[PDB]
Amino acid sequence: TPLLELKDIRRSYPAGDEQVEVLKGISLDIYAGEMVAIVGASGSGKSTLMNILGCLDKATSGTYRVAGQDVATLDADALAQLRREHFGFIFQRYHLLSHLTAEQNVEVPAVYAGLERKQRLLRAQELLQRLGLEDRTEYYPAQLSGGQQQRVSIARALMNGGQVILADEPTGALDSHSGEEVMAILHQLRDRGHTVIIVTHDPQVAAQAERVIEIRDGEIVRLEHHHHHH
């Protein structure tokens, strides 16, 4: 029974009596413990769907339920708590603060789940070690490669649990070697029960998912299952 549920999710930005219709009725269910890919062109509306999935954006109409909870009914604070209960985020860019260490960057999400620095630190390190950065815990971003910075950003995504990992083109700025490393960590996390949603233009990255949703213009056009040789 599905951890995330969307029915008829629409999105339009107001513009006079005219509106800008980005997503035009997307119904879709995602389960715990799977890697899903959402693939489509720039313009497809795959970005908005990501932001909606992450609750960094409100659907204009439709019903988005996350672990049962319909999200439209919640205040900014309670939405924020839910988002922290369930979601982690990585992107093509790494979004690290240049004047914070790797360990420090990893702590950041936990700050606002209210846990104090001693517990926070201990978890950040465990998580950076888990990602093969035991000896990089006090390195600054400018001392690290893309590849490493993205592992830092993954460890940051696990900080509040990261039950659902939303990855936007997480290998877009990476060489073929760093890409595989990133993918293999994402398969590993999905192996350990995490859900991983990955958005890409590239159907080769998509092909690695267990299921592949394609959006053309605010609308799903194709769902595919894949079983794996990862």
Asked if residues 185 and 151 have their Cβ atoms less than 8 Å apart, the reply is yes
**Amino acid occupying residue 226:** H
Instruction: Please state the φ and ψ torsions of residue 202, each to the nearest 5 degrees.
Output: -90, 110
Q: What is the DSSP string of 65-102?
A: EETTEESTTS-HHHHHHHHHHHEEEE-SS----TTS-H
Asked if residues 225 and 210 have their Cβ atoms less than 8 Å apart, the reply is yes
Residue 46 marked as a ligand binder: yes
CATH of the domain at 84: 3.40.50.300
Give the technique used to solve this structure.
X-ray
Residue 37 pairs in a beta bridge with 198, 212
Residue 40 marked as a ligand binder: yes
Asked if residues 36 and 73 have their Cβ atoms less than 8 Å apart, the reply is no
Q: Are strands 69-70 and 61-66 parallel, antiparallel or unpaired?
A: antiparallel
- The DSSP letter of residue 17 is B
- CA angle 5-7-92, nearest 5°? 60
Cα separation, 34 vs 194, whole angstroms: 7
Residue 41 marked as a ligand binder: yes
Location of structure tokens 């990893």: 106
Q: Provide the number of structural domains found in the chain.
A: 1
| Resolution of the model in angstroms | 2.4
Residue 67 marked as a ligand binder: no
Residue 43 marked as a ligand binder: yes
Secondary structure string (H, E, C) spanning 209-220: CCEEEEECCCCE
Residue 7 marked as a ligand binder: no
Residue 12 marked as a ligand binder: no
For residue 83, what are the domain limits?
Answer: 1-230
- Start-to-end Cα distance in the chain: 25
In sequence order, the 6+-apart residues with CB closer than 8 A to the CB of 130 are 155, 158
Cα separation, 210 vs 207, whole angstroms: 8
